[PDB]
Ligand binder design. Structure first.
Ligand SMILES: O=P(O)(O)O[C@@H]1[C@H](OP(=O)(O)O)[C@H](OP(=O)(O)O)[C@@H](O)[C@H](OP(=O)(O)O)[C@H]1OP(=O)(O)O
Ligand SMILES: O=P(O)(O)O[C@@H]1[C@H](OP(=O)(O)O)[C@H](OP(=O)(O)O)[C@@H](O)[C@H](OP(=O)(O)O)[C@H]1OP(=O)(O)O
Ligand SMILES: [Cl-]
Ligand SMILES: [Cl-]
Lengths: 313, 314
């Protein structure tokens, strides 16, 4: 008997050791667009050296022009309006803000904030319902109260920031709707592979989409969770493209590289090592799920298939 | 005709809702054996600080200092208070009081001294002492078994670094004082401003019933403004024959603030403090007058009552 299967390593961590303690500033609002903004229509750039890839390899762009997805970090309401306008130039279909954040977040006086616990794991272990209830309660409790909002600096701890008495509170759903985007939430934990529940939820949602839907994915930084769902969408929509091409091209338009690479973390971040290894293994397993289940139209969900076809370290 | 706020009460014009608490501030890092600015009335006088533009050649009278029996300091960890108590016990066989002058809610989380800090350290501004202590009791209790962020203030008087911990023990300063072998007395005085008539009436009633050999250890957060104000008050009350100049010079020269006139200079960001420094200078003078004019009948008239009939002038 195995306590936690591959793909579920985070279930072994204790939520009580990462409880939220500060309203973290998610974006300072200085730039017109959020960080790491990219779309599937973008030109491929040279790969980042840390992934030790072949800079001479040219991945297939088959299906990219029709993929219709984008990704970014968190944003201020003004930045999201800029994103929405930019994306409307590319499609006449519904544009979705696909919020991948498990952490409670929202807007206080229009400032994007999140209730941050160590490793951004303040809602670790909570069901999506419980995470969203926490978020609603916390945002409502901030109205007309004094809050401390701060960017994280040295040691991933607050440094500087501002103190204000809040006059307006909004959820991201409200901000997305104000920007003209549809909204869909998947509560995925920062830094780790999305859970079978997260992925089943995404696949059920994907199946409901009209042909011309545009998906704008984001979490906090626009790297791990954001690229994971962009990669899964590319695999689902372009199943004839090789795994190597999908991973190279999603990295080369500005995302994380989800293939094998020599992992090296700073000593203070050594806890991340096994989670990067787990993601590499799980990306391969998701590709296998798509290849094995697309012909019959996915009559068995990812969670069930993964239980009978466990991933191996 | 009607004056909204008299001299001595300027802080009543400030709006409490603009300075609400937002972080557990680290009050002392615990690295030294004693709290900062620790001094006693038995100490030798040192040269005055240049910023006060005093006469370095002046030799203040030490009349009554040997029997004064008071000390002052900044906030402290429990270990530091035990070291203070041991040092004071070498100087007296009477009861030693921890006279906590802090209006801000504070206490100890896992033995770490913290305070609920709002801008200007005014998180309990405008509250009665009853309300301030109720806030403190509730906040300390609510921290038990919960995760808290404790941080020192750095650039811009805002949190910088610090630590995050799940609290396993909570204590009030009263508990910490009793564990150190000291009696405890609380006066909820607001940081940076002249103590209120309510604060001073409370102190005078307390002073009147003290045993002859009581030793009073005063402290607030830094061991400067409120700490020195009450040390000066006590010196004046106990040694009424000593001149105002001697009291102010000597309390400054053993390590306290200088409460007489001086060239007030503030950084632009601290310009709000200017009028409060001026107010403290005139109120120190007014308190000296109260002591001189009310000692003969044994202070039958409370300070608050006397001050309303003899208001200070700006
Ligand atoms: O962008 P920075 O330099 O800050 O590093 C972030 C992570 O990106 P990577 O280092 O490429 O892994 C990013 O994704 P993960 O790979 O899944 O860890 C992670 O979301 C982001 O953390 P947050 O901003 O808290 O959301 C950065 O990681 P840390 O610096 O470990 O926090
Ligand atoms: O110790 P520093 O140099 O940092 O300044 C403290 C104040 O002392 P002074 O500047 O000497 O006036 C001190 O007393 P006040 O004169 O009554 O203002 C004041 O209590 C202390 O604030 P806290 O540590 O927050 O309690 C310092 O004042 P600020 O620097 O304005 O915060
Ligand atoms: Cl769930
Ligand atoms: Cl099934």
């Amino acid at each position: 008997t195995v306590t936690e299967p591959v793909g579920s390593y985070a279930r072994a961590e204790r939520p009580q050791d990462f409880e939220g303690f500060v309203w973290r500033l998610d974006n300072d609002g200085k730039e017109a667009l959020p960080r790491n903004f990219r779309t599937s229509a973008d030109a491929l750039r040279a790969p980042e050296k840390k992934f030790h890839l072949d800079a001479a390899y040219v991945p297939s762009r088959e299906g990219m022009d029709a993929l219709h997805i984008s990704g970014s970090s968190a944003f201020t309401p003004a930045q999201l309006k800029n994103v929405a306008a930019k994306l409307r130039e590319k499609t006449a279909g519904p544009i979705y803000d696909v919020d991948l954040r498990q952490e409670s977040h929202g807007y206080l006086d229009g400032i994007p904030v999140s209730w941050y616990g160590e490793r951004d794991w303040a809602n670790l272990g909570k069901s999506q319902h419980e995470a969203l209830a926490d978020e609603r309660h916390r945002l409502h409790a901030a109205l007309h109260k004094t809050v401390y909002i701060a960017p994280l600096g040295k040691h991933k701890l607050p440094e500087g920031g501002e103190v204000r008495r809040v006059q307006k509170v909004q959820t991201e759903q409200e901000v997305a709707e104000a920007a003209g985007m549809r909204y869909f939430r998947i509560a995925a934990t920062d830094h780790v592979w999305p859970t079978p529940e997260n992925i089943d939820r995404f696949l059920a949602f994907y199946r409901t989409l009209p042909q011309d839907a545009w998906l704008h994915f984001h979490a906090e930084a626009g790297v791990g969770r954001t690229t994971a769902f962009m990669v899964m969408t590319d695999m689902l929509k372009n199943p004839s493209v090789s795994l190597k091409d999908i991973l190279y091209r999603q990295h080369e338009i500005g995302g994380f590289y989800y293939g094998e690479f020599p992992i090296k973390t700073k000593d203070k971040d050594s806890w991340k090592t096994k989670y990067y290894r787990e993601k590499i293994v799980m990306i391969e397993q998701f590709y296998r799920y798509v290849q094995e289940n697309r012909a019959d139209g996915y009559q068995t969900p990812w969670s069930v298939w993964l239980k009978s076809h466990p991933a191996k370290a």
